[PDB]
Design an enzyme around this catalytic site. Structure first.
Site, mmCIF file in Angstrom:
data_model
loop_
_atom_site.group_PDB
_atom_site.id
_atom_site.type_symbol
_atom_site.label_atom_id
_atom_site.label_comp_id
_atom_site.label_asym_id
_atom_site.label_seq_id
_atom_site.Cartn_x
_atom_site.Cartn_y
_atom_site.Cartn_z
ATOM 1 N N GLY A 37 3.183 6.342 10.652
ATOM 2 C CA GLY A 37 4.528 6.265 10.088
ATOM 3 C C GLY A 37 5.298 5.012 10.477
ATOM 4 O O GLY A 37 6.470 4.865 10.131
ATOM 5 N N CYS A 43 4.301 1.917 9.487
ATOM 6 C CA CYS A 43 4.046 0.876 8.478
ATOM 7 C C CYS A 43 5.387 0.392 7.933
ATOM 8 O O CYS A 43 6.250 1.209 7.633
ATOM 9 C CB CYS A 43 3.152 1.388 7.346
ATOM 10 S SG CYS A 43 1.542 2.032 7.873
ATOM 11 N N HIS A 81 0.797 -1.229 0.000
ATOM 12 C CA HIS A 81 0.000 0.000 0.000
ATOM 13 C C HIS A 81 0.837 1.290 0.000
ATOM 14 O O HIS A 81 0.291 2.365 0.245
ATOM 15 C CB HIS A 81 -1.055 0.021 1.125
ATOM 16 C CG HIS A 81 -0.514 0.236 2.500
ATOM 17 N ND1 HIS A 81 -0.117 -0.825 3.289
ATOM 18 C CD2 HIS A 81 -0.373 1.384 3.207
ATOM 19 C CE1 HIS A 81 0.290 -0.288 4.428
ATOM 20 N NE2 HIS A 81 0.152 1.038 4.425
#
Lengths: 301, 306
Positions: free
Chosen positions: A143, A145, A41
């Site tokens: 932040g 991920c 993503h």
């Protein structure tokens, strides 16, 4: 002496964290050899997050769209391949700080360390347990991920988790290092149900053995129970049924303390029916289940 | 989302861990530049430990009697000195993995991360707090002496603690990186005991701020108690005395959650007398005092609607 929740030294994993930038979306990446692993993503913006077509979003992307950054140095992508929910990016430099890694999928009940990262920089490290519903009681700010979950076997770093999405119910969903999600989750920002969270029976029994080793033993009783009789009480307090495979794992812990596996079950049964009455075990008033039998051995040997 | 006890990334500290052998003893050393820091008791035998004279014992020892291993590689010792309870061994090579560092002396109540090491090899990392009685509730075993405690100030590793020994209650005691012990402890085989431990006031307050941010707020109440009124209840349940400077530290958390400092103290006063009745705060039946306001701000982030 002393019993602490301990994470593995994050050093080897730190030399693999990069900042992956795709347009506006920036997350963390795992640089192992000349391949950067990150959640797919990263191509999606705050727009696509509800229902994104990942197979069609990759088509409008090229090697120049990805901006892998290893601290100060700006690495250059020479190939992109999206496997399951993880995007693999081939780069020029084959990472000099690559440890002897391996990719495994942890089963529910097992534990691993999480190295939380923000904008490609390691923030902190903590010990996690994969809950039976496939969720983790973690701490992920915007932040994080791409942050990885791992275990260390002397020199071998076994990667097992990558943070993808934040569960609305507070919990955190992610995939293994091959892109396969844990549980019934997908990489879409929708209302996803975690399910019922059962207490890991074998992990509490391992934690009780650690209390005996540390001298704290006010919970020991004369009663004794069998596997089928103990399992009846387990289905009333949201507990997992104890199989014969679990008893085989609790071998070295039973031989070190001396208390038999079937006898320890009766001490656990009395604490759930009566309670702790204000007293504490190992410095805690709650039955802790985030400690596998192998975690107890690692710290008491 | 979420709130967990978090240690600092131990990578920069793992590059400084070495194994220090003197005769029969083996513990951990901290290789910063061309100097190895370790507990001075490494020069004693079990027999010398009953009444050691470290000055005379170090006179009888020389560079050849100190085997410093950086993994499998050996560092040649070219000097040896003693600064309080720490032994400083000069080596022929400066550590390439030496990060930015400074030696600090933390106050009790403050937190730090510990890298537990065995024979020069890091085993694990956990978040510790200096207890009011100057001990730490860690998890150390034989081979852990010389394991360090540290904080990371963005690019600089602040070394603050070195492990030396364990007390009869299972608690640990150590020195700062200059050799001064924390507490009334000494590196000698004699009868020693931690003493009376209390609960940290300013730390339990910050933990309640973090629970409010993460949803949990069943413990809140319309009560409001003053600075000296709460201090009377604190000395009954074994708690630290709250000062005005302690309240000033809780400023950003008060301004973020919109709960005044004295309002959170009033809610805490009710939790001491009434209790929790089984219901948990952040999945905890006991009040946690190992989180300073600084650690809560660092994890919860937050925004002050000025």
């Amino acid at each position: 002496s002393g019993f602490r929740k301990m994470a593995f030294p994050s050093g080897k994993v730190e030399g693999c964290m990069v900042q992956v930038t795709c347009g506006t979306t920036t997350l963390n990446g795992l640089w192992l050899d000349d391949v950067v692993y990150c959640p797919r993503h990263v191509i999606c913006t705050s727009e696509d997050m509800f229902n994104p077509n990942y197979e069609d979003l990759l088509i409008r992307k090229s090697n120049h769209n990805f901006l892998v950054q290893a601290g100060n140095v700006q690495l250059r992508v020479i190939g992109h391949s999206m496997q399951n929910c993880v995007l693999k990016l081939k780069v020029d430099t084959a990472n000099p700080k690559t440890p002897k890694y391996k990719f495994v999928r942890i089963q529910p009940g097992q534990t691993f360390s999480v190295l939380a990262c923000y904008n490609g920089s390691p923030s902190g490290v903590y010990q996690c347990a994969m809950r039976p519903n496939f969720t983790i009681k973690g701490s992920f700010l915007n932040g994080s991920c791409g942050s990885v979950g791992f275990n260390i076997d002397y020199d071998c770093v076994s990667f097992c988790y990558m943070h993808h999405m934040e569960l609305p119910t507070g919990v955190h969903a992610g995939t293994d290092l091959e892109g396969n999600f844990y549980g019934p989750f997908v990489d879409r920002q929708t209302a996803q149900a975690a399910g019922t969270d059962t207490t890991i029976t074998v992990n509490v029994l391992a934690w009780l053995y650690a209390a005996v080793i540390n001298g704290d033993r006010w919970f020991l009783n004369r009663f004794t129970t069998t596997l089928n009789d103990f399992n009846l009480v387990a289905m009333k307090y949201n507990y997992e049924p104890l199989t014969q495979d679990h008893v085989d794992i609790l071998g070295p812990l039973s031989a070190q303390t001396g208390i038999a596996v079937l006898d320890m079950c009766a001490s656990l049964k009395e604490l759930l029916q009566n309670g702790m009455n204000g007293r504490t075990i190992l410095g805690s008033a709650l039955l802790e289940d985030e400690f596998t039998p192998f975690d107890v051995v690692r710290q008491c040997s």
